[PDB]
């Protein structure tokens, strides 16, 4: 898993 993935709704 990527700690810098988008953490907000609807990427």
């Amino acid at each position, epitope marked *: *898993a990527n*700690p*810098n*993935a*988008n*953490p*907000n*709704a*609807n*990427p």
Partner: antibody, heavy 127, light 107 residues
Framework: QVQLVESGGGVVQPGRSLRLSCAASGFTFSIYGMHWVRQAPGKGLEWVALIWYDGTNKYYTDSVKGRFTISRDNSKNTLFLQMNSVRAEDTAVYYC????????????????????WGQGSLVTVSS | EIVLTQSPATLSLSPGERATLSCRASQSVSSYLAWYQQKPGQAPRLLIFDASIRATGIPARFSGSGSGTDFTLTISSLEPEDFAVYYCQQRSNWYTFGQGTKLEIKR
């Protein structure tokens, strides 16, 4: 309208626990990732932890991993930092911050910056 | 772990003058860089993100440039409300900040 109001700070003895709260108003809390960032007295900014909009994924900086827990209650528009096993080096002003989600008319999308911040809550770890 | 190094440590200027602040990363961060302003006792404020995009509500005198490892924040005409500490931050690999540059009033 965007507001983040923190509460829960104060003095805590080493080894004990303290829970911080960040009450959000003025935006759709449940669509935003949320972070905690801290600033020790006289020093710079250090990212602490992040939680996804839906409470699933959570990430922590190495020095707090296994001691602090991030959580949120979307129905109450509140973000939490549960600080356990605290140490003197955790003394700092703790800020909550919203993930600066950004998009344009052409499908560009950004995140991973801190666009609105709480007022800060001082946590003093001392005996 | 990416280390961001800011220079100079202090800049001493007068209103009206151009201020140039530098941030150097230990390895490339592409364009995933932001700049913040912070005044004593207050929370930081996001100025610039993705190296060069101005945040909503930020005056046009603030601009950011650079990519890779070398970045610059320019304030084209300093105004009194700009005296503060400035930090850079990257989100290419985890989340780290520079150590700050203080922009102080010369006299």
């Amino acid at each position: 309208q965007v507001q983040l109001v923190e509460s829960g700070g104060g003095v805590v003895q080493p080894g004990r626990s303290l829970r911080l709260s960040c009450a959000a108003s003025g935006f759709t809390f449940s669509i935003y990732g949320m972070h905690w960032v801290r600033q020790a007295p006289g020093k710079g900014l250090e990212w602490v932890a992040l939680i996804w909009y839906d409470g699933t994924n959570k990430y922590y900086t190495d020095s707090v991993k296994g001691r602090f827990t991030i959580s949120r209650d979307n129905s109450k528009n509140t973000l939490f930092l549960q600080m356990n096993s605290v140490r003197a080096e955790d003394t700092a002003v703790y800020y909550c911050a919203r993930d600066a989600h950004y998009s344009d008319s052409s499908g560009y999308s950004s995140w991973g910056y801190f666009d609105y911040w709480g007022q800060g809550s001082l946590v003093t770890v001392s005996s | 772990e990416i280390v961001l190094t800011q220079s100079p440590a202090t800049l001493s200027l007068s209103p009206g003058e151009r201020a140039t602040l530098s941030c150097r990363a230990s390895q490339s961060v592409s364009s995933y860089l932001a700049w913040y302003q912070q005044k004593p006792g207050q929370a930081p404020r996001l100025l610039i993100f993705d190296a060069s995009i101005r945040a909503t509500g930020i005056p046009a005198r603030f601009s950011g440039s650079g990519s890779g490892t070398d970045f610059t924040l320019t304030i084209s005409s300093l105004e009194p409300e700009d005296f503060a500490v400035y930090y850079c931050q990257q989100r290419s690999n985890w989340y780290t900040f520079g150590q700050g540059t203080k922009l102080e009033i010369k006299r």
